[PDB]
From a paper:
Ubiquitin specific protease 7 (USP7) catalyzes the deubiquitination of many cellular proteins involved in tumor suppression, neural stem cell maintenance, DNA damage and immune responses. USP7 consists of an N-terminal TRAF-like domain (NTD), a catalytic domain (CAT) and five C-terminal ubiquitin-like domains (CTD). In fact USP7 was first discovered through its strong and specific interaction with the ICP0 protein of HSV-1, leading to its original name of Herpesvirus Associated USP (HAUSP). The fact that several proteins bind to the C-terminal ubiquitin-like domains of USP7 prompted us to identify and characterize the interaction mechanism. This study shows the structural basis of interaction between the first three C-terminal ubiquitin-like domains complexed with an ICP0 peptide, revealing a protein binding pocket at Ubl2 of USP7-CTD.
Numbering used by the authors:
A (entry chain D): 617 to 626
B (entry chain A): 543 to 883
Amino acid sequence: GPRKCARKTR
Amino acid sequence: RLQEEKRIEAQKRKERQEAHLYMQVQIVAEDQFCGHQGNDMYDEEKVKYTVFKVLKNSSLAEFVQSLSQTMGFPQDQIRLWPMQARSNGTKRPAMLDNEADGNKTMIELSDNENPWTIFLETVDPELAASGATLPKFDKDHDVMLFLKMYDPKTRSLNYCGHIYTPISCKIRDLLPVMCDRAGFIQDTSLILYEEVKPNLTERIQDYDVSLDKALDELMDGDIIVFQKDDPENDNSELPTAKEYFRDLYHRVDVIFCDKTIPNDPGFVVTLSNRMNYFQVAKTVAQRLNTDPMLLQFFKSQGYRDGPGNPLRHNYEGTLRDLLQFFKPRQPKKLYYQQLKM
Ligand SMILES: [Cl-]
Ligand SMILES: [Cl-]
């Protein structure tokens, strides 16, 4: 399905 | 009594010599997030934790158990969200994996971090009496968000708690809840943002999309900030969260001293680095109950202390520029004198 990210990358 | 002072100094050396076996664990409760005005959840300086001296190699299940007894909550009616320091200079609650992370030690769960800070989600003990419980959380399909309301009138942030919701959900479906929590009428016209990091506050444009798509890098502990979509906002000083977090990022405290008054200890003013002459003049004139047109300001000398060149009123610059020659330590001061009528 639709997932969340593992890691923020900004 | 002298023996008892030899037992006190002695036992405290064991604890000094055993401290390498122990880690601290700082628990923070949602009450702590209330009325916070800055980015993320709370101010590290003003926060109040429930600390725990805990064995580095102890198990999670043990802590969980202990906790439930110290604080006074059922073990199935509390969830732990370890605080994470991200790359991008934010600290948010992150998930933790009970199943796969079940048979590991504490210290390793902190990723060798110590102290280790953890968000404690518990059911309100008031609502808990009334048949309520802590909901299930499909790690894979649900997400935990946090809601913040911004009032342009008051120029303040008002915490509106967190929600669990499925990733697949549209943003349009979470508007009611936002309205409610903020205490607005249903079908109130809102404006939404993601608090991403300090200074960065992206507007959410399409509500009719899934949360997945709507927040760039969706994750648990993402923060939506919302407000009224009202004309009255134009009246205010900071209509958007976006602007708020800027004023906040660029907030800086400046002391102002009368040149004509030798050794004047003067007054602090809290200002924004991206102000122009006009905005700095107008601020200080309000603090002196005087027309800004009667204020002459003076630039920094750089090396020496004391007023420098007299600042013309067509100065095309910003305060950042005025302050640029103050070492980090150095307190930030600017000299002025009043003119005549
Ligand atoms: Cl203001
Ligand atoms: Cl004063």
